[PDB]
């Protein structure tokens, strides 16, 4: 007779996740400013890492957090990113105080909680850009020609953030980005 | 397979 696992096990996530950090440094390269923080695979280790790091709104201009599935680098030239794109949300400057941190947390919860049902295997990761002209949050998808997966992810994401129906967000392919047109909108 | 509600996750933050 053995101990009941629910009294002592950490709560496991579907996936291992990696949090990355981008440091704004013009003397270094893009590749070398992008660096791993740490990995986690349970709810308890996710909060241990979230609770000691700075909120996005307190970061210096030019920095990014990136949360990607273990094995996928947060750059578009990665094998699981190069045929996909991203649902992009652009925030005005006033949103920095009121929505940035709440949207980014909600975004983290959607990834680690697998909120996109069977299209969750299409999710690669998410990036928040802290910029003086306007912050941006985005969820990256592995294939831009998978219409039904991309469409479902975009719609679920937009209502999870609480965005009003009149506010339109676009999905832009990494290959087109590399003034970008939207393949999809919700 | 392992799916979690937002309110369930937010309960382990503290
Ligand atoms: N080698 C490699 N360099 C990158 C990458 C990248 O994935 N790989 N990215 C991220 C990225 C994500 C999605 C689509 C595109 Cl086109 C680019 C930015 N860079 C470098 O930074 C430049 C623009 N980057 C930034 C923005 O846009 C910002 O905001 C910010 O910072 C790019 O032209 C590259 O020189």
Numbering used by the authors:
A (entry chain A): 27 to 204, 210 to 217
B (entry chain B): 621 to 634
Copy the relevant paper text.
Initially, the 40S ribosomal subunit associates with Met-tRNAi and a group of initiation factors, including eIF1, eIF1A, eIF2, eIF3, and eIF5 to form the 43S pre-initiation complex. This complex is then recruited to the 5′-end of capped mRNA by another complex of factors (known as eIF4F) consisting of eIF4E, eIF4G, and eIF4A. eIF4E is an indispensable element for cap-dependent translation initiation and plays a major role in recognition of the mRNA cap structure (m7GpppN, where N is any nucleotide). Under resting conditions, eIF4E is kept in an inactive form bound to 4E-binding proteins (4E-BPs); once the latter have been phosphorylated through the PI3K-AKT-mTOR signalling pathway, eIF4E is released and can associate with eIF4G to launch translation. eIF4E is overexpressed in numerous human tumours, and it contributes to transformation, tumourigenesis, and progression of cancers. eIF4E overexpression facilitates translation of weak and highly structured mRNAs that typically encode proteins involved in cancer pathology, such as proto-oncoproteins (e.g. cyclin D1, ornithine decarboxylase), angiogenesis factors (e.g. FGF-2, VEGF), and factors related to tumour invasiveness, such as MMP-9, due to the ability of eIF4E to stimulate eIF4A. All complex structures showed the characteristic cupped hand structure of eIF4E with the ligands occupying the cap-binding site.
The positively charged N7-methyl guanine system forms the characteristic cation-π interaction as expected. Fig. 7b shows compound 4f bound to the cap-binding site of eIF4E. The guanine group is located in its normal binding position, stacking with the side-chain of W56. As predicted, the squaramide occupies the α-phosphate position, making interactions with the side-chain of R157. The chloro substituent of the N7-benzyl group causes a rotation of approximately 90° in relation to other N7-benzyl substituted cap analogues. In turn, to accommodate the extra space required by the chloro group, the side chain of W102 is re-oriented away from making the usual cation-π stacking interaction to a position similar to that seen with 7a in the presence of sulfate (compare Fig. 6). Furthermore, substitution of the phenyl group with small and electronically neutral groups (3-Me, 4c; 3-Cl, 4f) retained the modest activity of 4a and 4b, whereas introduction of larger and more polar substituents reduced or abolished activity. However, our structures highlight the flexibility of the m7G-binding pocket, especially residue W102 that forms part of the cation-π interaction characteristic of cap-recognition by eIF4E.
